[PDB]
Structure formats: structure tokens, C-alpha cells
Design a protein around this ligand. Sequence first.
Ligand SMILES: *[C@@H]1O[C@H](CO)[C@@H](O[C@@H]2O[C@H](CO)[C@@H](O[C@@H]3O[C@H](CO)[C@@H](O)[C@H](O)[C@@H]3O)[C@H](O)[C@H]2NC(C)=O)[C@H](O)[C@H]1NC(C)=O
Ligand SMILES: *[C@@H]1O[C@H](CO)[C@@H](O)[C@H](O)[C@H]1NC(C)=O
Lengths: 51, 153, 50
Amino acid sequence: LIDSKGYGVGTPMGSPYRDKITIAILQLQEEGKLHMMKEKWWRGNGCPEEE
Amino acid sequence: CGIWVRTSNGGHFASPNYPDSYPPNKECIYILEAAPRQRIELTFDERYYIEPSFECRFDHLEVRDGPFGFSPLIDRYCGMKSPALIRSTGRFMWIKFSSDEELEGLGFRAKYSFIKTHGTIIGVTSGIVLVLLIISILVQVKQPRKKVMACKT
Amino acid sequence: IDHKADLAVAPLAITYVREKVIDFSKPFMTLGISILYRKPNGTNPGVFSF
Ligand SMILES: *[C@@H]1O[C@H](CO)[C@@H](O[C@@H]2O[C@H](CO)[C@@H](O[C@@H]3O[C@H](CO)[C@@H](O)[C@H](O)[C@@H]3O)[C@H](O)[C@H]2NC(C)=O)[C@H](O)[C@H]1NC(C)=O
Ligand SMILES: *[C@@H]1O[C@H](CO)[C@@H](O)[C@H](O)[C@H]1NC(C)=O
């Protein structure tokens, strides 16, 4: 890695939606649906290993 | 200091030393885990009926909507009020009880409700290894036949 | 900005400048930049290494 940035969700300014979608995002994270969901669109085809 | 109250449709949570003064210098995180689709019903049992005119520090009881110290803040309570009941479907309540270096209180009372074998065998086509070993063993077997025949002759 | 839509659910950098003008949720995935380059041609064929 070189740097690290953030993907979050944009929203109207000061809208209550943001702070109550934050908890949902956190819930999804601390469940684990995020990882397998990520794989499901990032699995693709596995390259054969190299020495 | 902490109490695991997980997998209880209901159960009882309170400041340590609930009937007596709560201990000083205490920092205990209390965790409420509700399974998915469950709605969290916290029931808080107040011990003292009087209205404080001041919301001051040193002594606070935190409520979080998701993992503690990390998730959105719901409230920071103090005084001798019972806070109003808290209904969230965030499925996770993460609570801390604090304490100062002096001047403790009556404590608080709460209720929660939920609704060499491998080395030989493993090789690229050990089959090749076995074939070579077979050839070698068989020819070694061939040898002493001609050895004995030469000795006879 | 103009309320004309709702939350833009899309891969977006949580950057400094947009921050003043839009609020952003706690991030759902991290980010990074890495180098990309080809594979080595290959091993010596190993037929006659002699
Ligand atoms: C009759 O008057 C008394 C005295 O003004 C009222 O009690 C309340 O007294 C406090 C004194 O500091 C006033 O300040 C407020 O305190 C509250 C609680 O800490 C705080 O949240 C406010 O921001 C403010 O600092 C308070 O204004 C005052 N309350 C009032 C005028 O409603 C008493 O309530 C009055 N009773 C009636 C029937 O109006
Ligand atoms: C082999 O190396 C050369 C570099 O000039 C180039 O053709 C390519 O990057 C590599 N692969 C093949 C198939 O040529």
C-alpha cells in the first residue's frame, strides 16, 4: 500500500439520515456481511500460484 | 466489573455495589448484544426522586448506538434523574459506567429487554518417483541372480 | 447541495474539500494506491541449462 483514503456515503448537510445510516454501516461491518459481499463482486478468477 | 448479559431476553444490570455507593475510579464497559431483527428495550430503575439543577462532570453514564466509544453518541447522563427509556433497533447497546476520585452516589439500577510419509508421497507426480524406485529395485533383484550363476560358473 | 437528490450511494473519496460542503458516513471500505506492472517473461525454460 502507499496511501489510504475513505469511501463513505454522502448526504444532505446536517440531515439526520447520515448519523442513522452510520450505525447501519457499522452494524454491517461488525457483522461481516461486508467481507463476503466484497468477495462476491471481487472474487473473479483465481490466478495460479507462483513460487 | 463487567457483566455479560448476552442472550437474555431480559436481565439485570446495575452499578457495582448497587445498594451501597458505587465504587470510585471505576471504568467498566457494559455490553448489550441483541440478535438481528430484535428491538432493544432498556428499563432503568431509578433509586432517588429529586431534580438536580446542574449537569456536571466527573461522573457520567454513556449510551452508544453501536460499539462503544466508537459509534454515534446517544446521550451522556448524570444527576439523580432516571433517563427516559431508550428504544433503538440498532441491535447493539454499548454502555460505560464511569466514576470520579471522590464523591460517589446511590448508584444506578437498569434492566434490558429484547424483542517422511508426506515427504515421499507429496511430489510432482511421485508416480515418477515410484516408477524409478521400481526400476531400481527390480534391477537390484536381477543382479544377485547373475551373481550366484557366476559363482556357480 | 440543493437537496435535489438524497444520499449519493456511490464509491466516493471522503476528502477534505467536499467535507465542508457534504457530510460523509463512517467509511464502509478503505482505500489505497498501489503500483501495477507486468509479470516476468518466465523461468529459464530449463531444457538445456548446460
Ligand atoms: C419560577 O422561577 C424559577 C427561578 O427562575 C424557575 O426555576 C428555574 O431556575 C433556573 C435557575 O438557574 C433557571 O435556569 C435554568 O436552569 C435549567 C436547569 O438547570 C436549565 O436547563 C436552563 O437552561 C436554565 O439554566 C430556569 O430558567 C428556571 N426555569 C424556568 C424559568 O422555567 C421555575 O421553573 C419557575 N417556575 C415557573 C412555574 O415558571
Ligand atoms: C517479455 O518481455 C518483453 C520485454 O521487451 C515483452 O515482450 C513482454 O513484456 C514480455 N512478454 C512477452 C509475451 O513478450
